[PDB]
Design a protein around this nucleic acid. Structure first.
Ligand SMILES: [Zn+2]
Length: 69
DNA sequence: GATATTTGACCGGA
DNA sequence: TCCGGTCAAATATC
């Protein structure tokens, strides 16, 4: 999983999120995560609130849809 | 609007 | 309390 190369454009979509000096290393280490990391979140939400007009019932609000598997 | 990078802060683990 | 991995605010460039 580790390789030695001379240009960093591996054709993947990378996003830099940090850079650290490392003890006993001459050069900093850069950190990248996938640009698409969050593109497949399940964004479905639900809100629940007892009704003012009827405390025996709940208003349930559905926001978004499920994409989870 | 929105997303990218830089870079010191922050935190967990040893 | 040192080290290193991640976060996030500032900043950039469009
Ligand atoms: Zn990916």
């Amino acid at each position: 999983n580790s390789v030695v190369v001379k240009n960093l454009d591996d054709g993947q979509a990378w996003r830099k999120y940090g850079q650290k000096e490392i003890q006993n290393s001459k050069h900093p280490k850069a950190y990248f995560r996938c640009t698409h990391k969050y593109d497949q979140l399940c964004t479905a939400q639900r809100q629940v609130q007892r009704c003012d007009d009827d405390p025996a019932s709940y208003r349930v609000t559905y926001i978004g849809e499920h994409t989870c598997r």
